[PDB]
């Protein structure tokens, strides 16, 4: 993995040592270059993880997420090239430093071969994310939103820390390989169930299921555009990545305790998407949408089925790219109009014709229509869930109905209708925005051709 | 006065200065090159060139090998006149059945 | 009702409110030596005798 981390860390001084104006140029060029190198990880051997060293390893589950993260890295730079602009040099240099540090932690986290080593870097991402949210956040309530973020995830993560160190004391090493091979059936005793609760709550906070999901409306809305994409496209899946990794040592205790979180999530996605059906803030609407799609994964992995995991990774990658996209779209609208209310800037297709097609494709992907990855992700969850319980399709099927309505609601309210009369500052779309979004949408269309790369480790 | 501040600035439209602005920087030379590098090392070098990389990656999960090995296995099993596949995987000859 | 009225007042606000009241008098003493050292007197007495730490 040192072919990726070492360039990434070494990339940080380069940004600090670039000229006043060339900072965005050099950083974007090599960040893409890192993404190209990271693409080499997509080759996964037959039935064994690509173990590079004791510290780092990768399999058919980490590699699709790693390349997504590195490929994401230039995208926050592009989306922030405009709202930052009028700032002192060092503050902009610091902003890039936070992003690169944040991406660097993610690369190490997904490749961590020790569950403890996972745990440090898994929450080490909190320090840069909190910095971006509170420092450059363009609103007032970012301070309370930042507090809601870290305290929610840390309150989940602390009981985790006690859990793994206990497993270390009982079974020596916490290595991901040795946990799988030397796995033992957990009992149903009241001691093990609290171990099960601790081993799951930390991951399910950044998953968030229904209930403990109230930093999602807070963190995303009042955050910089770069932060909104990062904390909706990667670290949400980072919390998920633990579940597939850590469920290896929670069987058969999953089935008995599966119900409370299954029932909370499965009813949740209807409730959350119902909130999506009528929202006043566009960014909030996209934020709640991420909860619904993420809740689809929570039921998915915690059913613990081959087909469930295979669709879980596919939905994860697809949703992250889509959620990252729509946040660009909201930011582009917000930058011009300086507001977030959806009905405030109705009728945008007439003025900006390209932005409609991007918004059409963005919502179309959120529709989870075939053959796009979102549909081939949700469909596999449906099949796995239906086999688990025949009455699942009543709930999760109804979601696609509710999902369709709100996912097209912003299309009607913003693009179609009538251009708002009093707004007269909507200039023609900058080629940066359109280029940024093409880097979001059509790579998804490629990935439709070859789903097996992201279909997960169970393919 | 309440506070001695400055009025909120105005959104500097990048086009009135230079009409061919690319939404990357106020200086025409840098932004034009910014467009050059984000594109070149974007769609072509990473997205298009990297596409053929993952498109032409060697056999994933040994998928081709799996069937190729399978075809021979059927050939003996079909011809020998025995069930195509036994109900058990670890055949119980070398198993120590409890009790 | 659920999301931003109850789900924020069950876990987040209640714990904030609980931490609020406790921090109210923990941080608000009177600064009198008499009250302090008297609180020492119980603490020493209750420590040896009634938590039975001497046993």
């Amino acid at each position: 993995m040192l072919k990726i981390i070492i360039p990434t860390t070494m990339l940080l001084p380069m940004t600090w040592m670039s000229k006043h104006n060339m900072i965005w140029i050099n950083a974007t060029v090599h960040s893409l270059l890192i993404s190209l190198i990271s693409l080499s990880l997509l080759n996964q051997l037959g039935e064994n993880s690509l173990n590079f060293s004791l510290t780092f390893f990768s399999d058919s589950l980490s590699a699709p997420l790693l390349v997504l993260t590195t490929w994401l890295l230039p995208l926050m730079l592009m989306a922030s090239q405009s709202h930052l602009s009028k700032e002192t040099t060092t503050r902009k240099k610091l902003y890039i430093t936070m992003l690169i540090l944040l991406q660097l932690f993610l690369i190490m986290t997904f490749t961590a071969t020790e569950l403890i080593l996972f745990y440090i870097l898994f929450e080490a991402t909190l320090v840069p994310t909190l910095i971006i949210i509170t420092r450059w956040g363009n609103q007032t309530e970012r301070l309370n939103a930042g507090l809601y973020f870290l305290f929610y995830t840390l309150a989940g993560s602390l009981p985790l820390l006690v859990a793994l160190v206990y497993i270390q004391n009982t079974t020596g090493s916490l290595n991901f390989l040795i946990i799988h091979y030397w796995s033992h059936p957990l009992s149903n005793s009241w001691s093990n169930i609290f171990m099960w609760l601790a081993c799951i709550m930390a991951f399910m906070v950044k998953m968030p299921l229904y209930g403990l999901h109230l930093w999602l409306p807070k963190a995303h809305v009042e955050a910089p555009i770069a932060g909104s994409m990062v904390l909706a496209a990667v670290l949400l899946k980072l919390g998920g990545y633990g579940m597939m990794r850590i469920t290896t040592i929670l069987n058969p205790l999953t089935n008995y305790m599966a119900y409370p979180f299954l029932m909370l999530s499965m009813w949740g996605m209807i409730m959350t998407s119902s909130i999506c059906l009528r929202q006043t803030d566009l960014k909030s609407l996209i934020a709640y949408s991420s909860v619904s799609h993420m809740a689809l994964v929570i039921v998915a992995i915690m059913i613990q089925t081959p087909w469930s995991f295979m669709g879980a990774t596919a939905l994860m990658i697809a949703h992250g790219l889509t959620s990252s996209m729509l946040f660009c779209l909201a930011n582009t609208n917000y930058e011009r109009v300086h507001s977030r209310t959806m009905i405030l800037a109705r009728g945008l297709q007439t003025l900006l014709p390209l932005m409609a097609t991007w918004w059409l494709m963005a919502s179309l992907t959120n529709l989870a229509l075939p053959p796009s990855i979102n549909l081939i992700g949700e469909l596999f969850i449906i099949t796995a869930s239906f086999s688990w319980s025949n009455i699942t399709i009543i709930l999760m099927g109804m979601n696609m109905m509710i999902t369709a309505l709100y996912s097209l609601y912003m299309l009607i309210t913003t693009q179609r209708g009538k251009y708002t009369h009093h707004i007269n500052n909507i200039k023609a779309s900058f080629t940066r925005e359109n280029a940024l979004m093409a880097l979001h949408i059509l790579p998804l269309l490629l990935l439709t051709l070859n789903p097996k790369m992201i279909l997960g480790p169970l393919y | 006065i309440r506070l001695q501040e400055d009025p909120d600035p105005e959104d500097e439209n990048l086009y009135e200065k230079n009409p061919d602005s690319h939404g990357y920087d106020k200086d025409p030379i840098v932004d034009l090159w910014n467009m050059r590098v984000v594109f070149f090392f974007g769609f072509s070098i990473v997205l298009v060139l990297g596409s053929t990389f993952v498109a032409y990656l060697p056999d994933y999960r040994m998928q081709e090998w799996a069937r190729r090995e399978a075809e021979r296995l059927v050939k003996y099993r079909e011809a020998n006149g025995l069930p195509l596949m036994e109900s058990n995987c670890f055949d119980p000859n070398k198993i120590q059945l409890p009790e | 009702l659920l999301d931003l009225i109850w789900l924020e007042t069950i876990l987040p606000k209640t714990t904030s409110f609980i931490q609020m009241k406790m921090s109210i008098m923990v941080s608000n003493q009177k600064g009198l030596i008499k009250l302090y050292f008297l609180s020492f007197l119980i603490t020493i007495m209750i420590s040896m005798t009634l938590f039975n730490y001497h046993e």
């Binding site: 450059w136 007032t140 | - | 609020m20 109210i24 608000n28």
Partner: peptide, 26 residues
């Protein structure tokens, strides 16, 4: 520009006791 704390925000973090009450009114 992004929101920045005003004088009223400072007065929040500006009392003798950060969370005022009747016992600490004076």
């Amino acid at each position: 520009r992004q929101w920045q704390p005003d004088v009223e925000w400072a007065e929040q973090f500006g009392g003798a006791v950060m969370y005022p009450t009747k016992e600490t009114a004076h």
